[PDB]
Amino acid sequence: KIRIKLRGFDHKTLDASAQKIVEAARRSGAQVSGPIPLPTRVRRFTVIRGPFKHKDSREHFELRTHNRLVDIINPNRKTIEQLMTLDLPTGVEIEIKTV
Amino acid sequence: SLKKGVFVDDHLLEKVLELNAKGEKRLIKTWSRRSTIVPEMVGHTIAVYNGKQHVPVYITENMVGHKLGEFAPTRTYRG
Amino acid sequence: GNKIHPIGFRLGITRDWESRWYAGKKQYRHLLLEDQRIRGLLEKELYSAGLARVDIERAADNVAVTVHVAKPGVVIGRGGERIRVLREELAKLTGKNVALNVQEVQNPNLSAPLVAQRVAEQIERRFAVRRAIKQAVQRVMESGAKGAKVIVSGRIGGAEQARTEWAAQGRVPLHTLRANIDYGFALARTTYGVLGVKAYIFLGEVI
Amino acid sequence: ARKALIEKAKRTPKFKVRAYTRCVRCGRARSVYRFFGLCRICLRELAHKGQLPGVRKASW
Amino acid sequence: RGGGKSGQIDAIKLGIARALVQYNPDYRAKLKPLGFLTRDARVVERKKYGKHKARRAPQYSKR
RNA sequence: AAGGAGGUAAAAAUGGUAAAAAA
RNA sequence: UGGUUUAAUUCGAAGCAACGCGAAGAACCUUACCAGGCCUUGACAUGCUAGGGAACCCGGGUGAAAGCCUGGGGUGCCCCGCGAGGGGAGCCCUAGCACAGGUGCUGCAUGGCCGUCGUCAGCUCGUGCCGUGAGGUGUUGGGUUAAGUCCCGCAACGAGCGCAACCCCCGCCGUUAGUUGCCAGCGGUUCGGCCGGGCACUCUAACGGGACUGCCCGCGAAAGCGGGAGGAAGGAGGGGACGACGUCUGGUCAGCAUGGCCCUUACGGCCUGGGCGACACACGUGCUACAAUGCCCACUACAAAGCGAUGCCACCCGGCAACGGGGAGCUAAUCGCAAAAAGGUGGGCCCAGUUCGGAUUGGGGUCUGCAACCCGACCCCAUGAAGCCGGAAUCGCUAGUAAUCGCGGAUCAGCCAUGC
Q: How does it assemble (chain E)?
């Protein structure tokens, strides 16, 4: 019944936040449907290499937003307690809901 | 284009409707040219700006509800 | 011609972002705005002891700054009466919860920003360009580095022709990655012009 | 003019249609990628100098 | 799913190949010399900044 | 032929750019 | 874009390396250009002298607008007060001052940043040897490669930045994982993944393995080449970022900083207008075309990627439409942009300045926006030019490349986007 989405720019750590949760949650309760990866939406940007009227000569840059999704079963007090308390995203965005 | 209505401005309005309180002097001195020509201006010496100076244009009928600053050349020099 | 920031290419596993915080699509702007302002007024003040990196974190009031200084000593002040005013103003123009953290790097002659800092500042104090700067590359490879290069471009001594005097010692494999390079450019200002000081320093493989 | 121009829009005048974006890390309106509130040269100087999250020296 | 009518066709071929080369890999012996497993290539390549169809370039002046 | 070489061959429609001066 | 011209048609860039280039959204804004109105301790910050106002909420005249002369309110706080008062601070006003400011010149004073030769294969270090020495050597010699790539020679042996490799996209497999997908396997059904169920398959997006001439045979002294297979993958698998030492006083002071020279109630600042879109020609990149492998109307098809909260906007409705009124869901793999188009499947045109091509043309409509004249996109219906496939010349492109066809995003009120 739990809808936890994790939006991330560093896919390395962002995934590390995806399985971690699942351990202690599969631990402090019952099943926790696997972290399931979700379409890393990417915002395409680009511009030219310099300042002066140089139509060619360009560099592309884009935003890598990886989506994560954890579903847990019927929650428990330990689970909810620690796994709403402890964290260290240091940036990464954590948004949950009751669907 | 105003789809429902016709764009004009109130400078001209207040002006025309006050000389109409009598029918006085044969001059007006407007700075707006974006405005739509109206028939209640009668149509004497609507002195409009151009880009360099005010240049009086005559107005009667066939300029009905089409824009003012169109009978003020601006684009000087010809070919 | 270019060279491109090794940095702006090392963002794989060789250069982790200076600012680490996720953002909303709308939000992005104002966030980075205040951010760059932080670094900004920080720059003018907390230069005094070599301001290299400026680690940034933001979660939601989590305004954690890990100011990589050079030597936080005569900069934290006695009892922290200087860390005080800075965190103060930090709060003054940040509508959230501020942090200081003076994480200077153990060793001086590493991380090229402060290298080039002292470098350009020697010319800022008029000093011998080639002599003391060759002494700088020297000092780098005298610290235990693997490759030091200092390009210095601009109006040396005036004389119209703005040369690009260059020195080096040790390998500088700029097309590589694992090797890892640190880049730092100081913005040298002659009383009579603006010359650009720039430095690359090499470290090693495997990492 | 320049200095006065940034101030012109910095204070929103009369009509909605007289605002124009502004590179607050360089100071212009041309090609200011509004998403960042940054011009294109300001954009590249930021992303390059490592002072911009979420990006990537893209290689797709 | 995907590609085009013909692309569909391609993937269909690919699979009809792979399926009989499972429940009887005896059919594999006489199907690679026939070339019924080499997948594909083809991509309307990443458009080159400066050129059109990543190859197609603008008319050169010189003058 | 691999080379160096001693004698006899082929090979250029056009032009003026100054200069005190930097490392 | 030259030229041309005007009051102004604002500058920049110039053989390749400028010409759909700064410009990735110039109606006024923008805006640096002009005519005019006007402010000027200045739209911006910085501090002092002596004075007054508390900040600050509203309004009237005037005018094109900025600007300008006044009117209603107004009296938060420190010290000393059941009393009178002043001084002090954010706080605005005026003189004076120190000043700001100037997209004015100077890229031949500069940084930085791109160009470009050019992914061209080039620039050198170390000990030794040759040369009085500058220095040469290594790097000149042959086969070979995309390659100073490798082999052979060899007075050298090697070593670093370059090439490559470590990085990403794309092709084969795997393990984690299952609100995308599905009877693939079961139940039912409003038979439409629609209702339960399930992770098999797509997919998603992560962590690796997989290809090295490794195997087989013939040639070459080897470097390599021929032939064949194992395999999704052959001999660098396709692509991308990647661009040295250096030149060129390239380009840029109008993105930025910037040494200097420079105007300082004017080269500063606001406003409203006008130009940046002008026209006797010329030029580069471009869209469309001039037609039956075609134009037209009807039915069905398969896209991939990128978007969307004060935005995406399916739906009925009014309108032939432009779009407007009521209206669902949507911080998105679940909602909508959105119909891909060519393909295919029917019927029309019958070779014609044609149902070709719409260039231009008039009487009306929709939308944004204060405002659509100069100078907006879009709708209607009536107009329907040149164009019969282009001489000298000259451009693109070696594989899913060219040619053809549709689709999105950037910035943007709108849109001149046939551009990128």
A: Part of the 30S ribosomal subunit. Contacts proteins S7 and S10.
Determination technique for this entry: X-ray
Whole-number distance in Å between D10 CA and G29 C1': 13
Between residue 132 and residue 191 of chain C, the positions with Cβ below 7 Å from nucleic chain F are 156-157, 159-161, 163, 165
| C139-167 burial code (b ≥16 CB/10 A, e <16) | bbbeeebbbbbbbbebbbeeeeeeeeeeb
C23 and D48 within 8 Å at the Cβ level: the answer is: no
Expressed in Å, this structure's resolution amounts to 3.5
Q: Determine contact, residues C6/C181, Cβ cutoff 8 Å.
A: yes
Picking from D35, D51, D57, the nearest residue to C28 by CB comes out as D35
Question: Are C186 and C117 within 8 A, CB to CB?
Answer: yes
Q: Where are the domains of chain B?
A: 1-79
Nucleotide G15 C1' to residue E61 CA (A): 10
Architecture of domain D1-60 in this structure: Irregular (4.10)
Architecture of domain C16-106: 2-Layer Sandwich (3.30)
Alpha helix (H) residue ranges in chain C: 7-10, 28-45, 73-76, 83-92, 112-124, 129-141
CATH architecture for the domain at B1-79 = 2-Layer Sandwich (3.30)
Asked if residue D26 belongs to a known ligand binding site, the reply is: yes
Residues of chain C with CATH 3.30.300.20: 16-106
Q: C21–D50: do the CB atoms touch at under 8 Å?
A: no
Q: Is E60 on the interface with A (CB under 8 A)?
A: no
Query: Which helix (DSSP H) or strand (DSSP E) does residue C64 occupy?
Result: strand C64-67
D10 is in an annotated binding site: no
Sign of CA dihedral C168, C173, C178, C182: positive
| Domain A1-99 falls under CATH 3.40.640.10 | no
Inter-chain residue contact D51 with C36, CB threshold 8 Å: yes
Q: What is the dihedral of CA A47, A53, A55, A61, to 10 degrees?
A: -10
Place of tokens 């640190």: C182
Element (H, E) at A96: strand A93-98
